[PDB]
């Protein structure tokens with residue numbers, strides 16, 4: 239069985255790995271190749287701070303709630319493993335700030351020690367009147383991506399750096415299954431009007447005294463669109479930009495001032511952190527994740543395409559669940575081809 | 579009036595500050611001076627991780643508990659100040675690990691969001707069956723000591739590097755008040771059998787992914803003597819060593835291993851942290867802080883000695899309370915001399 243994964247973000251690589259470690263002992267020639275226009279440093283996944291946190295309001299598909307849950311329980315089970323540091327995996331507590339009282343998140347019992355802000359804490363943030371506090375996990379995209387490769391490489395998963403033009407192209411050269419993990423750019427290979435870029439821009443700053451994450455929430459601004467501060471391993475992420483439809487992969491000097499002024503108002507100590515660099519990325523926005531099979535009707539017969547894109551602003555949070563699912567689906571294919 | 583302060587550690591400097599700001603206006607010639615044998619870079623106060631947290635069991639003088647309280651609200655109130663970083667001040671949440679269930683601390687409501695660890699959290703630390711979790715503060719002793727220094731230097735307080743041989747020596751040469759902040763070395767000036775060196779050794783290590791302090795408790799070894807992990811700004815502090823009576827200011831190879839071994843067990847990810855520094859220190863251990871006046875009867879008249887030492891292993895946690903008290907005690911000295 240020749241298997242071609244398109245894309246090398248958290249999704250492609252996490253799906254690649256899963257499919258391997260779950261089916262390599264069962265399929266005799268399980269040949270898995272990764273095709274991607276961009277690698278390790280130049281993906282959206284690298285632009286992610288990697289804070290685990292699904293939306294506030296429930297998802298359109300309750301499957302997703304489990305997927306995130308699955309992912310959290312996985313990473314948490316490994317927070318102490320001797321490899322945690324290569325993964326870029328660590329614990330982080332922090333604040334979720336709100337203007338008015340809002341219902342508990344469905345994930346409340348997933349994070350460690352969930353609870354509500356005690357007045358003295360809100361005192362630290364004059365402009366916010368209510369909020370949560372809990373312990374969570376960070377999985378730095380860059381590190382994680384780097385770690386996934388090593389696992390993948392020693393597993394014989396070959397990487398090629400190319401821009402796939404069509405699903406047929408990849409089919410024409412032997413692919414029995416095509417795992418489709420092409421992120422926001424998925425549209426180029428098959429129309430999907432429901433997919434939109436959630437353009438983001440961030441600032442990496444040096445402020446090692448910040449030990450907590452601090453996410454603001456504002457209805458006049460909308461999801462991911464108010465100041466947030468996520469302490470990384472080597473550097474603190476200053477962010478708060480989400481613009482639908484914007485394809486401009488370029489740091490914007492107007493957005494810069496937004497990030498800076500917003501985060502500085504939040505935490506004035508950040509008023510003397512040294513700016514280390516700025517980045518722009520595209521959230522794979524979709525009413526829900528396309529995580530399903532499709533019989534792609536090739537030449538004489540047809541070839542199986544598993545879709546795995548549209549994880550919007552919470553890829554790292556959900557990725558592992560999705561991978562395990564993309565693997566189950568893979569396994570179904572194997573059954574139907576009676577090559578199980 | 580002529581004030582001499584002996585001690586350039588947290589107590590000396592912080593006391594001098596309180597005295598000055600409270601009494602520069604009311605005294606015609608308020609002339610404060612600091613004599614110290616060691617300064618800002620080479621004090622015990624410089625080995626202190628700086629974690630705010632008093633003992634678990636209530637102290638002697640219940641007035642102490644009030645002092646830690648004053649200190650904690652003072653610091654919390656400046657956590658977002660423009661100069662919080664020069665102070666070396668920041669917020670930090672973390673764990674406290676106990677073997678069996680055990681009654682809550684007296685301070686439970688001074689810290690932020692105090693609560694008990696939920697079973698899952700306790701599953702992170704297999705060796706511990708019960709504990710607390712709260713947000714707290716660090717005042718890195720070094721950064722703080724440097725900040726005070728500038729404050730004092732700005733306020734015209736003069737510094738002299740000298741070994742004071744006796745109270746009288748300093749009285750003979752002109753002092754009207756002698757604020758005694760000689761910490762653990764207080765004995766060499768006035769017999770105090772209760773004062774004792776609580777020797778400790780720390781390990782500064784480079785593990786920026788750690789966002790929480792982890793303190794352990796084990797009665798078989800008592801306070802300060804079980805693995806602890808305190809994330810500073812530049813580096814993580816490893817520790818767990820308390821030795822009463824030991825006056826060796828010298829890093830110990832057996833102590834090292836003990837620290838390193840103890841801490842790697844607590845949190846395995848430390849196993850791959852690079853070791854940056856190693857340092858010994860003496861907690862000024864006493865049944866209780868001595869914070870009181872004393873008329874030292876010299877020649878014609880006598881001079882006034884405010885004693886302020888014996889803060890053991892919680893000097894930073896408590897410094898501001900004590901400092902305010904010594905300034906109050908200094909106040910009366912004033913009224914009685916008809917200088918109010």
Ligand SMILES: Cc1cc2nc3c(=O)[nH]c(=O)nc-3n(C[C@H](O)[C@H](O)[C@H](O)COP(=O)(O)OP(=O)(O)OC[C@H]3O[C@@H](n4cnc5c(N)ncnc54)[C@H](O)[C@@H]3O)c2cc1C
Nearest residue numbers: 245247275276283286288289402421438519552553554555
């Ligand atoms: C600023 C910002 C902050 C974020 N913070 C977080 C956070 O804290 N937590 C969190 O969970 N998520 C966060 N996210 C979002 C999350 O990181 C993404 O949803 C996640 O990375 C999704 O994985 P992916 O689908 O992006 O893989 P991608 O990064 O989209 O993978 C794309 C790869 O596939 C290749 N490709 C695409 N089309 C083709 C083609 N036709 N031929 C060949 N190759 C192709 C590309 O070249 C690229 O190499 C953040 C996002 C942004 C922008």
Ligand SMILES: Cc1cc2nc3c(=O)[nH]c(=O)nc-3n(C[C@H](O)[C@H](O)[C@H](O)COP(=O)(O)OP(=O)(O)OC[C@H]3O[C@@H](n4cnc5c(N)ncnc54)[C@H](O)[C@@H]3O)c2cc1C
Nearest residue numbers: 585587615616623626628629742761778859892893894895
């Ligand atoms: C390893 C370790 C970790 C610690 N961690 C913490 C923590 O996390 N939180 C916390 O709150 N506390 C902690 N402590 C304790 C705390 O650091 C001390 O209790 C605190 O610094 C007390 O202030 P001080 O008396 O030490 O001032 P000192 O450090 O004692 O100042 C001494 C100065 O006085 C001078 N001096 C002394 N005698 C004379 C003399 N006769 N003539 C002239 N000069 C003299 C000395 O040369 C020196 O300059 C820790 C202690 C240790 C050892």
